């Protein structure tokens with residue numbers, strides 16, 4: 135067992151680092167199962183040469199909508215749950231993380247099947263905020279996934295290995311994903327199938 | 331489908347922007363139905379030439395009150411729910427947003443009908459906080475709606491259109507509202523009517 | 527109806543203000559009923575000549591305790607609820623506010639009667655944080671109430687009046703309290719009495 | 723009864739203090755019972771010569787995991803509850819505090835017995851954030867506990883005494899722990915045993 139973090143709070147990541155450069159999100163999001171739940175996931179990278187303090191991730195679904203009364207809200211925003219209720223949206227971001235949105239009854243993907251996904255006109259905006267530890271300054275980084283950038287039935291390739299007491303990141307694999315056996319039903323349909 | 335936000339996090343809003351100027355709230359609030367719920371709504375504008383980081387909206391009802399014991403609290407404040415429990419009060423404010431307060435059993439408007447509204451001596455204070463992305467500094471903008479500035483049975487005119495790959499804002503329409511068919515009952519009365 | 531706050535966000539408080547000076551808490555806390563609930567209350571003042579942005583109030587009970595297993599924690603701290611769950615701990619602090627802690631089943635005062643109060647060895651630490659609007663800087667102000675500084679059966683004298691379109695504060699009354707008819711039972715005892 | 727904190731907000735701790743130096747976490751975490759609950763605890767120290775404003779504690783369990791579907795997440799992070807839901811993670815850090823994680827059904831230690839603990843490949847990362855009151859700057863301090871640094875059946879030795887109106891800290895005892903009678907069952911097993 136080789137420490138991620140030393141008792142003195144130094145991280146055993148990126149040997150020879152010195153902990154302006156910009157934060158990377160994965161080009162694609164993926165949907166697939168984790169412990170029996172359908173989840174939407176995307177990857178967020180760290181800053182090789184600074185800690186980000188009070189780092190937090192949020193995500194908005196951007197989607198035009200009509201209310202039952204006929205009000206048309208172009209580009210309507212709604213907050214997509216990525217750990218808000220348990221503090222898991224507060225990141226310890228010292229190597230890349232896969233951020234997971236569990237597609238449950240409160241999720242806007244609840245009723246979206248694999249066939250249905252491509253027909254949807256929607257966009258996920260991902261927003262990381264924090265304080266660059268050196269800089270002193272609050273920062274925000276953003277990205278976006280439209281429908282065609284969400285891969286149904288895929289997982290992220292892992293980036294992290296241990297070399298000589300220090301965890302290292304294959305940034306070559308950062309955006310890489312692979313196919314895995316995944317149902318094609320919506321989360322709602324899965325839940326209904328499961329409940330008889 | 332034309333992106334709101336580019337993979338690199340630049341927003342496709344206000345072509346030729348450069349992302350001190352001051353934030354605008356709509357002159358009026360409106361009350362009307364959205365998906366079968368009575369909602370109080372107001373509009374908050376963006377800053378044409380800076381992002382606001384960690385932007386959040388709150389609202390206080392200011393209303394003198396007497397407790398059942400006879401204590402008189404002049405200008406008593408109470409927090410009006412505008413997305414606190416789901417993180418929807420954390421704004422991605424890159425074009426104007428309609429902020430919605432659903433008038434449910436916990437709302438101070440729960441028992442206020444259309445006829446009753448004008449007889450009420452109350453004020454809504456709206457408070458946007460965040461960090462101007464350039465400036466570096468925390469900012470706060472405020473406004474206020476007294477009873478006569480709340481329009482029962484109205485919606486906001488939409489401001490947003492797509493022109494040549496870029497979303498544009500008709501600021502001429504920012505404060506504009508229009509009439510829509512709306513019950514005159516209080517939310518409480520609506521709920522009671524609905525439950526038989 | 528004279529506005530607390532103008533559409534442009536200027537506050538109608540302290541005519542001739544210019545919105546380092548220090549924040550005042552009331553010398554005493556009081557306990558008495560509000561709408562059928564026993565509440566512990568204290569007063570927090572505003573800064574005559576700056577807004578405080580992202581202002582928030584918290585309070586800790588400081589009290590030595592022994593666990594059932596016999597562990598002695600000197601000066602053990604626990605968080606006293608002053609609006610955390612509804613966002614009412616986020617203050618719009620432009621004139622003095624009475625901050626209220628409702629003494630319910632989760633409160634550390636739940637079982638404390640009027641006779642019992644003076645026998646208790648406890649201290650309430652009150653902590654206001656925020657950003658002074660000019661200064662630029664985060665600030666914290668603190669105070670403290672020991673047992674003998676908590677007045678059972680009292681309310682705060684009101685400080686606020688309207689003079690010529692502007693709300694004014696009688697700072698002479700800031701610390702002043704008055705006696706009101708109040709049961710001497712603990713909140714727990716009151717609840718039990720009420721439930722038969 | 724000698725005040726922890728004076729009415730003017732000065733703390734009666736470290737006589738002759740002047741309220742860069744670095745924050746200390748205890749070398750070890752301990753597990754033992756508090757009021758009938760198994761708790762994981764660690765100690766966090768204060769800064770002798772500055773207040774920390776808006777101080778907050780969080781903790782991540784770092785543990786490689788395989789999902790039921792066979793996805794391997796190396797160094798998977800999950801947030802360990804240390805007061806998030808009651809605001810008790812917001813510290814009034816003016817002398818050392820023992821931070822407590824109650825091992826309940828939602829805890830990742832729920833099923834970990836005393837014999838099982840040493841066989842686990844896990845790490846707890848503890849993260850204190852806040853604003854150094856003078857400095858002006860946001861700070862973060864970190865540390866870490868691997869399995870062998872968690873002492874099952876132990877409590878922290880108390881550090882705090884009153885000398886001449888001022889609370890003083892025996893920093894010699896800061897890391898010191900002592901053995902106490904503690905069941906060897908997992909929290910889950912304890913709960914099951916208790917429920918018949």
Ligand SMILES: [Mg+2]
Nearest residue numbers: 188384580776
């Ligand atoms: Mg901040």
